Design a protein around this ligand. Structure first.
Ligand SMILES: [Mg+2]
Ligand SMILES: [Mg+2]
Ligand SMILES: [Mg+2]
Ligand SMILES: [Mg+2]
Ligand SMILES: [Mg+2]
Ligand SMILES: [Mg+2]
Ligand SMILES: [Mg+2]
Ligand SMILES: [Mg+2]
Ligand SMILES: [Mg+2]
Ligand SMILES: [Mg+2]
Ligand SMILES: [Mg+2]
Ligand SMILES: [Mg+2]
Ligand SMILES: [Mg+2]
Ligand SMILES: [Mg+2]
Ligand SMILES: [Mg+2]
Ligand SMILES: [Mg+2]
Ligand SMILES: [Mg+2]
Ligand SMILES: [Mg+2]
Ligand SMILES: [Mg+2]
Ligand SMILES: [Mg+2]
Ligand SMILES: [Mg+2]
Ligand SMILES: [Mg+2]
Ligand SMILES: [Mg+2]
Ligand SMILES: [Mg+2]
Ligand SMILES: [Zn+2]
Ligand SMILES: [Zn+2]
Lengths: 214, 127, 97, 25, 97, 91, 201
RNA sequence: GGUGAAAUUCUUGGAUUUAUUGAAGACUAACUACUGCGAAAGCAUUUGCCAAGGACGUUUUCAUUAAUCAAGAACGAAAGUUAGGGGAUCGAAGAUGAUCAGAUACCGUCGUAGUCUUAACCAUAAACUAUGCCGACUAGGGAUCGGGUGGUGUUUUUUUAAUGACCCACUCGGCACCUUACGAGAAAUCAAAGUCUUUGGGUUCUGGGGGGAGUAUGGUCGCAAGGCUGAAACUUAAAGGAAUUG
């Protein structure tokens, strides 16, 4: 004698700025009654959409994104960065036998003071003419690849918030400066950022947040 | 084109779950389990069941609003079997075959940088 | 007596590896003695692939298989998986197929 | 009987004759 | 390292150990660099420092106790301060210090 | 000339109270009676005098510490954890 | 009669030219001649007194106030402390876990002094003989030694009498018992050898 | 939920599923291999620090300083013990749900100690290659790990190089595998288990039919549990190994 759907207030999800479709999807709440309202209650949920489902082209089939809801207005709720994950399949595929895996991470701030820890993975590659059947690095190789990745990733951040960092990551500029520095040490294939998580946001700043909008 | 949500099909042995939610997760929409749609414990996970539950589940999905939905299929995981149950397939199968849309579906099985000792002790389950 | 130079399986110059847990019965078993299978397989399956792209958005989509490494305990590897048991000679052949 | 179980057999058996001899110390 | 430079100073130069005399050093402007131990109390410190700036002597706060500074200079007792008068082959006066 | 096989300072209790207890008391007597390194002037001359109070022969500094030892394990970690959290406030 | 040493700490008097002295329970590692800082805007060092509001969770303090300015009530015995385990800034509260294991939530203005109380471990040491007990209570109160109520005549105690010594009835007494009845295990909601780990969840 | 099937159990306390965040302790998945290192036990996230090592290179240095070892000593998986801490997980004991003729078990649940760590004990494992160490010699092949050498080799573009990773030949020293077998073995098999009635390079240690029995005893070490050392009476015609056909 209820059926919450005869009572669910409804809603649609809007995305930020540095992508393609600002429109994402729909949601449900509960009519903003006196004592417990649809506003302040939830909103502050999160949503994971593959950015190939967000940027259009599938050269992006992996690479998932975490968007969070901060502010809301009349059947319209905006969203801002909250993370970026890979996919299980790609990773589980990238990790082949017969080759060295190399991972490394760092914790670092931005201008607009969000704190994050981004990750990075690479794999030693066979060189085209290789006779031996595996290709492994010399540890000393691996420590030096990590140190560069590290030297690189710490530079890439503290540039104009995730804002720019977001704009930085999407076309994977980082990926190739890695590839750049690296090739002086060792072959290496794939080479991605793979993960980045958020752990200490600044303060709301209704002004600044509203900058990705229009 | 559609209105979107998330599928999330947990298929272990002994039972298979299906339940669509708001693409944010916080808000449900219709569940129903393999156990629900037949009665004999032993059969609580069979594809023949997971179908009839994915039947009920699709119905409420298109009866409330969701026109489409991405799936995140999943085994027990942790320190357990890690491999998909029987009724993951049938469910998926019989829920796209219900006239709902499919789009970009990954496997969200939890997998650990191993440990917390598995159960059943160093000598295995001997029976 | 002896009926394997590799003794159990695969450890020359180590003295101690480290035990994994059998995917089937959970028996502990040294990693090098383990017996392993890469269970790479489609997320969908046999029949579903048509009714996949049929009731979907996107063109043909992409499709992303599931990959996981399987470890058996001999007894479990024998009871079902890779084993049979082989003649005194067939034994020595390590070639997969 | 299993060797390990007979090794325990006599292991006990000693711990008992150990006992009875102390009554006499 | 700094101790390595220090023990070079010791075996080719002229120094003096401990409070009263590295004050005589400071008054006569004979001191080229005084070295103050971690734990020596902040009066002794502040005062030496005062004396120091009055003769313009650069001061090196030795991260380490009077017990080690004694070892630093190869003596089996403890020293709270060392004073440099002649720097041997060592470059202490004109390195990072 | 090794005087006793294993009782050490715990000799005084002769035979009474039983090994176990004597063993325990020995451990902490040795703890509580011993001379310690002075954090300030740096001569091993902190001797005890009533639980918790550790003072220095010369230089005369007196520090609150453990009941039978200068620094209790807990209070030390507490030291270093206070290090950590304070770090969080200038950084 | 005190496990832990005291620290005599002297202050200037804000309002009159003169020294005014306080009696602090010494936290471990504070020492003679050390400068002690007390106040809202004061730094996070061992020995200072700070209002639980201003210290990050995980802080470890002593002699903490139940209500602001009660001049210090919680954890004072040689070896104890309390741990801030989070704050709720609106209605400035601050949740702590006391020595007992209990969590309790008090005003953020409640002061506490950073550290643990000195003299820890005092109870690890066997008294050994009756005398050391004796000399212990000699400076506490007249509670020692203790005649077993079961060795008294019945005039004397619920346990008294019998032709053998025995409690003769359940020794777990009701909370609602009446004076002259409550001797035994008052209000005991279990009894027997505590097996298994303890430690509040 | 769990199983072969179940039941104990959990569920207006919205279980199980979902979502966001938080805490605890353990662990180090995939990459992981007939790959590495260490005297053995053993060792797999990063990064700093601390000292250590082999192999290699060497027209450096000392110059017999060495090989092996009763006594004695360092270390020594798991469990177990002492005193703290920790106590997520899994879990001897215990209790239960089932199964069973029974079922003190196998299977399911609750779960103590334990599992982790500090200080200290204990000194044992199929602690296994069931194969002592140093030296010599005797026979083919392709991989590989480390080091070095050689090349008008490849790939990296810039302006050629320099590098780096690769390729090819060689050579020390590793972890193994291949095929042979002059040879050895009771055989299985073995580049040593070969160079042994054609019996000798140097040295350590252990065994002498089976059971009695690693029992008794003494000594000794240990908090203990127990470790080391360790008999005899009596009994007995086989125990045992490897291969063969059933
Ligand atoms: Mg056999
Ligand atoms: Mg046989
Ligand atoms: Mg071993
Ligand atoms: Mg008697
Ligand atoms: Mg009295
Ligand atoms: Mg009494
Ligand atoms: Mg009494
Ligand atoms: Mg009487
Ligand atoms: Mg009564
Ligand atoms: Mg009475
Ligand atoms: Mg009575
Ligand atoms: Mg009695
Ligand atoms: Mg890893
Ligand atoms: Mg002797
Ligand atoms: Mg010996
Ligand atoms: Mg436990
Ligand atoms: Mg039982
Ligand atoms: Mg029963
Ligand atoms: Mg039993
Ligand atoms: Mg042995
Ligand atoms: Mg073996
Ligand atoms: Mg050869
Ligand atoms: Mg070359
Ligand atoms: Mg006969
Ligand atoms: Zn198994
Ligand atoms: Zn002193």
């Amino acid at each position: 004698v209820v059926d919450p759907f005869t009572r669910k207030e409804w809603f649609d999800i809007k995305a930020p700025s540095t992508f393609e479709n600002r429109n994402v999807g729909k949601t449900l709440v509960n009519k903003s009654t006196g004592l417990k309202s649809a506003s302040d209650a939830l909103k502050g949920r999160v949503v994971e959409v593959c950015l190939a489902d967000l940027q259009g082209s599938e050269d992006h089939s992996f690479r998932k994104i975490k968007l969070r809801v901060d502010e809301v207005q009349g059947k319209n709720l905006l969203t801002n960065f909250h993370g970026m994950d890979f996919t299980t399949d790609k990773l589980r595929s990238m990790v082949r036998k017969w080759q060295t895996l190399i991972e490394a991470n760092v914790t670092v701030k931005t201008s607009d003071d969000y704190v994050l820890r981004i990750f990075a993975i690479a794999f030693t590659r066979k060189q085209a003419n290789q006779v031996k059947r595996h290709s492994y690095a010399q540890s000393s190789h691996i420590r030096a690849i990590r140190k560069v990745i590290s030297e690189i990733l710490t530079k890439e951040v503290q540039g104009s918030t995730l804002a720019q960092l977001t704009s930085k990551l999407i076309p994977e500029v980082i990926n190739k400066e890695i590839e750049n520095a690296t090739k002086d040490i060792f072959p290496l294939q794939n080479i991605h950022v793979r993960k980045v998580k958020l752990l200490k946001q600044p303060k709301f700043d209704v002004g600044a947040l509203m900058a990705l909008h229009g | 084109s559609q209105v979107f949500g998330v599928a999330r099909i947990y298929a272990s042995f002994n039972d298979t779950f299906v339940h669509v939610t708001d693409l944010s997760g916080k808000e449900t929409i219709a569940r129903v389990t393999g156990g629900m749609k037949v009665k004999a414990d032993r059969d609580e996970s069979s594809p023949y069941a997971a179908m009839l539950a994915a039947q009920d589940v699709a119905a409420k999905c298109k009866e409330v609003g969701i026109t489409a939905v991405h799936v995140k299929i999943r085994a027990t995981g942790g320190t357990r079997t890690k491999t998909p149950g029987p009724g993951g397939q049938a469910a998926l199968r019989a829920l796209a075959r219900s006239g709902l849309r499919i789009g970009r579906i990954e496997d969200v099985t939890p997998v650990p940088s191993d440990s917390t000792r598995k159960k059943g002790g160093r000598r295995g389950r001997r029976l | 007596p002896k009926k394997r130079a590799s003794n159990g399986r695969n450890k020359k110059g180590r003295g101690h590896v480290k035990p994994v847990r059998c995917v089937n019965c959970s028996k502990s078993i040294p990693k090098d003695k383990a017996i392993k299978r890469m269970a790479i397989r489609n997320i969908v399956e046999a029949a579903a692939v048509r009714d996949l792209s049929e009731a979907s958005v996107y063109p043909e989509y992409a499709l992303p298989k599931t990959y996981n490494k399987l470890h058996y305990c001999v007894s479990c590897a024998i009871h079902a998986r890779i084993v049979r048991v082989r003649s005194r000679e067939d034994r020595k052949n390590r070639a997969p197929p | 009987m299993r060797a390990k179980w007979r090794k325990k057999r006599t292991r006990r058996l000693k711990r008992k004759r150990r006992k009875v001899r102390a009554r006499s110390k | 390292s700094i101790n390595q430079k220090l023990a070079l100073v010791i075996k080719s130069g002229k120094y003096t150990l401990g409070y009263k005399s590295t004050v005589k050093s400071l008054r006569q402007g004979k001191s080229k660099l005084i070295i103050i131990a971690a734990n020596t109390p902040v009066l002794r410190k502040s005062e030496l420092e005062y004396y120091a700036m009055l003769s313009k002597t650069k001061v090196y706060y030795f991260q380490g106790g009077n017990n080690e500074l004694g070892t630093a200079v190869g003596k089996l007792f403890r020293v709270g301060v060392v004073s440099i008068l002649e720097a041997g082959d060592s470059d202490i006066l004109t390195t990072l210090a | 000339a090794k005087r006793t096989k294993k009782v050490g300072i715990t000799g005084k209790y002769g035979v009474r109270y039983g090994s176990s207890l004597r063993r325990q008391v020995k451990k902490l007597e040795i703890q509580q009676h011993a001379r310690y390194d002075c954090s300030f002037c740096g001569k091993k001359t902190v001797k005890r005098g009533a639980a918790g109070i550790w003072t220095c022969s010369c230089c005369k500094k007196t520090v609150a510490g453990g009941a039978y030892t200068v620094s209790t394990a807990a209070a030390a970690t507490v030291r270093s954890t206070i290090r950590r959290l304070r770090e969080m406030v200038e950084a | 009669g005190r496990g832990a040493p005291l620290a005599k700490v002297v202050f200037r008097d804000p309002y009159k030219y003169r020294l005014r002295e306080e009696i602090f329970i010494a936290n471990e590692g504070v020492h003679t001649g050390q400068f002690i800082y007390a106040g809202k805007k004061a730094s996070l060092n061992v020995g200072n007194v700070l209002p639980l509001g201003s210290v990050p969770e995980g802080t470890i303090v002593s002699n903490v106030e139940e209500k602001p300015g009660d001049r210090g009530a919680l954890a004072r015995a040689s070896g104890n402390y309390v741990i801030i385990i989070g704050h709720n800034p609106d209605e400035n509260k601050t949740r702590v876990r006391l020595p007992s294991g209990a969590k309790k939530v008090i005003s953020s203005d409640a002061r506490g002094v950073i550290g643990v109380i000195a003299g820890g471990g005092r109870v690890d040491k066997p008294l050994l003989k009756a005398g050391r007990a004796f000399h212990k209570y000699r400076l506490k109160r007249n509670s020692w030694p203790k005649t077993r109520g079961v060795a008294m005549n019945p005039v004397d105690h619920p346990h008294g009498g019998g032709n053998h010594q025995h409690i003769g009835k359940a020794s777990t007494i009701s909370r609602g018992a009446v004076s002259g009845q409550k001797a035994g295990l008052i209000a005991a909601r279990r009894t027997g050898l505590l097996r298994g780990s303890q430690k509040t969840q």
